[PDB]
């Protein structure tokens with residue numbers, strides 16, 4: 011059920027999203043900008059292992075389309091994006107180090123949600 015605070019919380023989520031897409035974090039955010047193109051990367055098992063792909067451009071489209079009804083729904087997609095990375099890639103892969111750094115950006119700012 012919609013709460014009076016959902017619009018303000020979604021503004022906080024949009025601020026986080028803008029930050030994740032900003033030049034400040036681009037050195038480690040870039041793998042997450044667009045859907046994994048498994049065929050182009052030669053990762054022909056990706057869609058057998060990952061049931062629900064997610065990436066920042068999809069989160070952005072969903073935000074722009076008013077798909078997210080609350081902050082927790084937004085957070086679930088961001089965390090799904092990171093979880094897919096941790097599931098598919100070896101834990102010592104460069105992309106996993108990037109995911110951990112970007113997830114730190116996300117989690118610490120998400121924790122500051124007005125409530």
Ligand SMILES: CC(=O)N1c2ccc(-c3cc[nH]n3)cc2[C@H](Nc2ccccc2Cl)C[C@@H]1C
Pocket residue numbers: 040041042045046047051053094095098099104105
């Ligand atoms: C998000 C994610 O999990 N992945 C992902 C997605 C997109 C891209 C991408 C986009 C444009 N060029 N490459 C690359 C990767 C990862 N590779 C990778 C990443 C950083 C350094 C070195 C390497 Cl090898 C594989 C993995 C499946």
